[PDB]
């Protein structure tokens, strides 16, 4: 819809600041850690794969979790309950056919009741004040993909893969905005596959250069290189599939040359 592409981009850039979680919230959580969050997000990747959910839905749920935990202290035994209600809310927002409540109870391995999941749904809504239409890494990526000459499916899937990996690790990715991470991921994918760089037209569109993307791009390069050794492996397994052109099997570059 070329009549609104600029208006939408501008609006998403405004909303992503307003929807940004608190950067240092984990320091303030007495019972949970970055490592425990990493386990939850990886589990949500599996649930998404199990029920054939959109990648958008997964990105939305993670945003809801991070915003919830920005103000609400949660014990380790209740973290999975927050995650389940968040994923249920994201499914209701984003999916044509969301899985029913019973199905979300089943995948918790009977840890929680139907009543508990429903009560948590209601609480997450109160805490987020029903503000669920948040911009994601995904929403920026698909706009950035339109600037390919020409369109490359390996580039697209590898950018989606890298953006997904950023969801796992609160340190350091909580400090970067969705549009910046999408920038880092798009350049890194485009460089790995074709040798090309962050294009001139996206500089005009976004205001971002390689210079401004450098810090996020430096972290994301390191996450990419160290991906086979990471404790959490569901994203790598997911992106082995031909649906995503087996992009996780590609070799990361050794240097970026910035």
């Amino acid at each position: 819809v070329p009549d609104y592409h600029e208006d939408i981009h501008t609006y998403l850039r405004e909303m992503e600041v307003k929807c940004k979680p608190k950067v240092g919230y984990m320091k303030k959580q007495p019972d949970i850690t970055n490592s425990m969050r990493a386990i939850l997000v990886d589990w949500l990747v599996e649930v998404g794969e199990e029920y054939k959910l959109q990648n958008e839905t997964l990105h939305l749920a993670v945003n809801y979790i991070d915003r919830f935990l920005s103000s609400m202290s949660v014990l380790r035994g209740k973290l999975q309950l927050v995650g389940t209600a968040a994923m249920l809310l994201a499914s209701k927002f984003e999916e044509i056919y969301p899985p029913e409540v019973a199905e979300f109870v089943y995948i918790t391995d009977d840890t929680y009741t139907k009543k508990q999941v429903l009560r948590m749904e209601h609480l997450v809504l109160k805490v987020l004040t029903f503000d669920l239409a948040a911009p994601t890494v995904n929403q920026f990526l698909t706009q950035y993909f339109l600037h390919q000459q020409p369109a490359n499916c390996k580039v697209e899937s590898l950018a989606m893969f890298l953006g997904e990996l950023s969801l796992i690790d609160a340190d350091p990715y909580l400090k970067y905005l969705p549009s910046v991470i999408a920038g880092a991921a798009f350049h890194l994918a485009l460089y790995t596959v074709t040798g090309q760089s962050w294009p001139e037209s996206l500089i005009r569109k976004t205001g971002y250069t390689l210079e401004s993307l450098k810090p996020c791009l430096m972290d994301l390069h390191q996450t990419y290189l160290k991906a086979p050794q990471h404790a959490q492996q569901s994203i790598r397994e997911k992106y082995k599939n031909s649906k995503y052109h087996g992009v996780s099997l590609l070799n990361p570059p050794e240097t970026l040359n910035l």
Binding site: K92, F93, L118, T129, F130, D131, L132
Partner: peptide
């Protein structure tokens, strides 16, 4: 039931922006 309907979730979130 099934919790808050997706229709209510969509209407509220979208209208708070608009």
């Amino acid at each position: 039931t099934e919790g808050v309907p997706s229709t209510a979730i969509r209407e509220i979130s979208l209208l708070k922006e608009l």
